[PDB]
Design a protein around this ligand. Structure first.
Ligand SMILES: [Mg+2]
Ligand SMILES: [Mg+2]
Ligand SMILES: [Mg+2]
Ligand SMILES: [Mg+2]
Ligand SMILES: [Mg+2]
Ligand SMILES: [Mg+2]
Ligand SMILES: [Mg+2]
Ligand SMILES: [Mg+2]
Ligand SMILES: [Mg+2]
Lengths: 240, 392, 45, 238
RNA sequence: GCUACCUAAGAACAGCUAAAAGAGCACACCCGUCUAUGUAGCAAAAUAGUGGGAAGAUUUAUAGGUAGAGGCGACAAACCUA
RNA sequence: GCCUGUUUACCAAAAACAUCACCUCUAGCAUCACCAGUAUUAGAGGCACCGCCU
RNA sequence: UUAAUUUAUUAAUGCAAACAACCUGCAUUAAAAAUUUCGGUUGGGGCG
């Protein structure tokens, strides 16, 4: 197929980008993921997941003003247009982020624990143990990848040496260098669980389509079965 | 995270043939064949020179080599720039103090009923109805059509006062005029390249509104600042620019003095339309730019407090909502935040009419709202007429 | 109900069976070569 | 330096008594290695005094390469053995950090693929009885299939009552005795039995006395004779 | 170029009732419940009446994509040029 | 059978399929699907809206 | 499908090979498959 990814834009921008739906299809044109197709046309707002991104020819901790908090069609979380210095960027909004609020993005690992105010980003080394966090990086400067969905919140479980133990929302422990940045608080749109789809049409609007033949293997779906050993073959299906 | 996936990035050229790595021998390529063959070496073609020269096949040089390129980056405000902080940002950029409401000097010009137009409300209602309903064979005219129409018809209605005011003969509304003004603000050099439209030029400069005492009183006022938003935000940071002050006209032009800048936000789509605050900011910046170009043309290119302040008006409208501005530039010493400050009187969100019903709404076969404007406000047209009559 | 499976459109015809698409693959080139060998008046569509 | 190590151990929750105990425990182990090992152990969620007890019991852990120690700790965290879970594991079988990654992985893969145990069930089994890791493959599969097919037990019950902890010899000795006595019946194709079978706690958890008095209702002499007979039967079969 | 699903960018949806609805009645439009006709027929699946939906998980034009043990499938082994 | 929908083009429109709702299982993660997403997420399977008594 | 035959291919491991990644060869276990078959007598079928 003549499929070229829509994710071709190279320069970050605030303008929503026209994104092409896939239908669950590979670049080969064959269905790779079932149950995807249609839905409301959407525009993609490029999220800057690296909260500590000091502006060009600038460095050090910087503050930013929350211009607005907006619904994002491409996420469970709602996003925040936030402006600092002479630039604007989209970030993931925390639970109580409001328009006009101020946000701190620092790389400073203070000797003492920094007062953790919801919404600001500090290196994990600077946070008190037991603080709720989100938008957690795996490596310093990689960019947030974990705890990004609406209402999610990891816990800074431990800090020893230069390594911090985080409890991901799946209640799995993760080891990250304490120099990696995370933002304080739980992600916004905390009521995303309680939303009721109500009707099949709403899922169709969200772009989920009812799809069958999801396995493509001979015989379709087949649950795993325990293959009895030769000694145990005599007891597999004992008649009544 | 890097933007732009590999599959969309330009493909890496195929590796060079190993024959090119062997020093002593000349590879045999398909260059002589004048066409590709897969079993011969790929030629290394020298770059082609005569290409990016033809006018229809031209490549501009890199920005570094352009004549007006400058290492110091100017911040330009053009017609399609939307200030984040709006009026506050414009006030900081222009070193201006805001005053709510139009000045009494201009507001009094319409208090007496002699200046009131005969059949004023009837004519204004006809203008609104023509712009919004009767303009075209189409049932509902779009904003791109009814904003310029409403502005031009209101201007004609005001110009009809030439009977009472013969001084109105010494003015003309020019279109597509473009001005440019540069000035410094705390080592930041800002330019305004105002294009807009409908510059009302007069043969005589407008009288100053603020007295010497008020201009000096502006010293105490502190210029409001916003943090962490820099005042530069949403201004085009450009290294290619011209620091010349252009008033938009050749020397010797009759009607040299700007009187009113009519800015109209006629975009059909709300996202393409300025917010009211951003429109007021654009009005402030364009009035300041025209006033500054006039000041640099008259009293030379010297930063100083103006002995004779330059007054420029502006009306910024979306077709329904109007904003009126009188800007007094009384200082070309903009770099410092201290001293006498320019001052702008702004009247905001003066809506000519609340809503217009192009179709008669019918509920249960009963006409509820008749066709036409609802909530028409003659006061806004009074203010418009006052601004037009100022200086006459 | 059936029989009208052909809903003509010259864009689809040329894009599906045209000379350029035939030459775009080695298999289609062999299609054209077979038609030339047979002596077809119309090599492609 | 010893200064840095002492400051770190003053941090991390360790008291001076345990710090001195561990310093004495050092069998030519560099202070840097000891600090790294203790740091990894408390990263795994283990408290300072269980860390001290474990290092006392098995000083060999301090000899582990830090790369291997970190890899094993990450693997255990992925397997879910962490915080208070790792404590009883490091007591019952402290050699998990010394076992081969391949051995642990193949035990887990046998439990999941060839035995159809959920991830949570695998974590519960490892937490309850780490002797499964010591137990060789093949034998473990035979034990599980004995529970599943011949005994008619399901995964939730096999996990609830730590069937995999008990020895295969004991399991067969009791189950075959019950079956030949007729007090235990393999569930049919429908999964039903004429009489409800005794519970696995009543079969394996209890001692021989109550096992023969309440579940089997037979005599200890008869049970001993049956055990010897079953040993002969197994030897002849194999 | 049928059909199934998808992609891009379009278009259509009277009137009444109701009021922001996978709402009601009912045109266009889509479908195909029942009956009759037809059965080499007008038709290799139609006609007439009746009936279901008809602002939506709708219908639909255009261009593109997925290819045979493969595709596609709100699974009927349905559909992929009778 | 929860509902509106879908299906055997051409003998079956249904109680069948789907469906909101719920449950189970799997997955700690970047530059071609999932997804420019990150466990309130994604994928798969089951069941049947809902509500009550145990 | 607990019919027979395979595991070429993938996925895991192991051992060699190249000095961790990656890759080659040889094994073992799986997944996915592939190929192939359906003796005779007894109204038929079950159990024979
Ligand atoms: Mg068609
Ligand atoms: Mg309608
Ligand atoms: Mg309806
Ligand atoms: Mg369908
Ligand atoms: Mg079926
Ligand atoms: Mg139904
Ligand atoms: Mg229905
Ligand atoms: Mg049919
Ligand atoms: Mg039918």
């Amino acid at each position: 197929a003549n499929f070229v990814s829509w994710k071709s834009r190279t320069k970050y921008t605030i303008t929503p980008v026209k994104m092409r739906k896939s239908g669950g299809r590979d670049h080969t044109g064959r269905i790779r993921v079932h149950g995807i197709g249609g839905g409301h046309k959407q525009r993609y707002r490029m999220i800057d997941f690296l909260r500590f991104r000091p502006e060009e020819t600038k460095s050090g901790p910087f503050e930013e003003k929350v211009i607005q908090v907006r619904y994002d069609p491409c996420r469970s979380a709602d996003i925040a247009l936030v402006a600092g210095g002479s630039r604007k960027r989209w970030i993931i909004a925390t639970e109580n982020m409001q328009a006009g609020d101020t946000i701190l993005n620092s790389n400073h690992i203070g000797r003492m624990a920094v007062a953790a105010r919801e919404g600001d980003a500090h290196p994990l080394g600077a946070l008190p143990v037991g603080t709720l966090i989100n938008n957690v990086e795996s490596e310093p400067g990689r960019g947030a990848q974990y705890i990004r969905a609406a209402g999610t919140c990891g816990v800074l479980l431990r800090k020893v040496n230069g390594t911090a133990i985080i409890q991901l929302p799946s209640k799995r422990q993760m080891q990250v260098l304490e120099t990696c940045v995370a933002t304080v608080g739980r992600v916004s749109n905390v009521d995303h669980n309680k939303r009721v789809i109500g009707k099949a049409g709403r899922n169709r609007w969200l772009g989920k389509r009812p799809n069958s033949g999801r396995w493509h293997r001979k015989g379709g779906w087949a649950g795993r079965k325990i293959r009895p050993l030769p000694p145990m073959k005599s007891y597999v299906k004992l008649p009544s | 995270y890097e933007w732009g996936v590999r599959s969309t990035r330009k493909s890496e050229p195929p590796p060079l043939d190993r024959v090119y790595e062997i020093p002593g021998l000349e590879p045999i390529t398909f260059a002589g064949k004048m066409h590709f063959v897969p079993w011969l070496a790929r030629p290394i073609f020298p770059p082609w020179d005569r290409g990016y020269k033809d006018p229809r096949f031209y490549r501009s040089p890199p920005l570094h080599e352009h004549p007006l390129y400058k290492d110091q980056a100017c911040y330009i405000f053009h017609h399609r720039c939307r200030l984040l902080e709006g009026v506050k940002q414009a006030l900081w950029l222009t070193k201006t103090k805001l005053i709510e409401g139009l000045p009494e000097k201009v507001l009094s010009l319409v208090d007496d009923p002699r200046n009131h137009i005969e059949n004023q409300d009837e004519c204004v209602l006809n203008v609104i109805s023509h712009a919004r309903l009767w303009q075209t064979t189409e049932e509902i005219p779009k904003r791109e059509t009814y904003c310029p129409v409403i502005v031009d018809n209101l201007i004609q209605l005001c110009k009809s006062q030439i009977l009472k005011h013969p001084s109105l003969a010494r003015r003309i509304c020019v279109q597509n005029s473009t001005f440019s003004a540069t000035w410094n603000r705390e080592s930041l050099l800002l330019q305004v390249r105002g294009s807009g439209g409908a510059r009302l030029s007069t043969k005589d400069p407008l009288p100053t509104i603020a007295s010497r005492e008020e201009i000096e009183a502006t010293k105490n006022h502190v210029l409001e600042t916003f943090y962490p938003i820099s005042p530069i935000i949403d201004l085009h940071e450009c290294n290619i620019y011209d620091v010349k002050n252009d008033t938009g006209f050749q020397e010797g032009y009759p009607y040299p003095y700007p009187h009113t800048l009519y800015l109209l936000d006629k975009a059909n789509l709300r996202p393409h339309r300025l917010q009211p605050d951003q429109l007021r900011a654009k009005m402030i910046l364009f009035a300041f730019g025209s006033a500054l170009a006039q000041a640099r043309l008259l009293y030379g290119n010297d930063a100083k407090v103006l002995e004779q302040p330059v007054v420029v008006q502006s009306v910024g409208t979306d077709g329904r909502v109007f904003h009126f501005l009188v800007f007094q530039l009384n200082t070309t010493d903009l770099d410092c935040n201290e001293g006498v400050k320019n001052l702008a009187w702004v009247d905001s969100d003066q809506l000519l009419y609340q809503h217009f019903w192009c179709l008669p709404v019918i509920k249960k076969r009963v006409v509820v709202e008749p066709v036409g404007p609802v909530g028409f406000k003659p006061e806004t047209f009074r203010k418009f007429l006052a601004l037009y009559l100022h200086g006459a | 109900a059936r029989g009208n499976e052909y809903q003509p459109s010259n864009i689809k015809r040329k894009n599906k069976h045209g000379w350029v698409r035939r030459l775009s693959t080695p298999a289609g080139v062999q299609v054209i070569l077979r038609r030339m060998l047979k002596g077809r008046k119309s090599l492609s569509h | 330096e010893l200064e840095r190590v002492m400051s770190s151990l003053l941090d991390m929750g360790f008291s001076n008594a345990h710090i001195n105990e561990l310093l004495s425990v050092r069998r030519g182990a560099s202070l840097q290695q000891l600090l790294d090992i203790i740091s990894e152990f408390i990263l795994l969620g283990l408290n300072p005094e269980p860390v001290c007890v474990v290092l006392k019991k098995s000083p060999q852990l301090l000899k582990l390469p830090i790369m291997q120690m970190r890899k094993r700790s990450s693997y255990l965290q992925k397997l879910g053995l962490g915080e208070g879970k790792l404590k009883r594991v490091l007591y019952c079988c402290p050699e998990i950090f010394t076992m081969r990654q391949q051995d642990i992985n193949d035990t887990v893969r046998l439990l999941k693929e060839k035995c159809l145990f959920t991830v949570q069930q695998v974590t519960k089994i490892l937490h309850s009885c780490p002797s499964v890791l010591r137990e060789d493959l093949g034998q473990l599969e035979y034990k599980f299939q004995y529970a599943y097919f011949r005994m008619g037990i399901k995964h939730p019950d096999i996990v609830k009552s730590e069937y995999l902890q008990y020895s295969l010899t004991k399991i067969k000795q009791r189950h075959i005795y019950l079956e030949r006595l007729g007090r235990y019946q393999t569930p049919d194709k429908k999964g039903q039995t004429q009489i409800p079978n005794p519970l696995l706690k009543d079969i394996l958890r209890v001692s021989e006395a109550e096992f023969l008095a309440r579940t089997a209702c037979t005599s200890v002499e008869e049970f001993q004779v049956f055990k010897k007979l079953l040993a002969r039967e197994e030897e002849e079969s194999e």
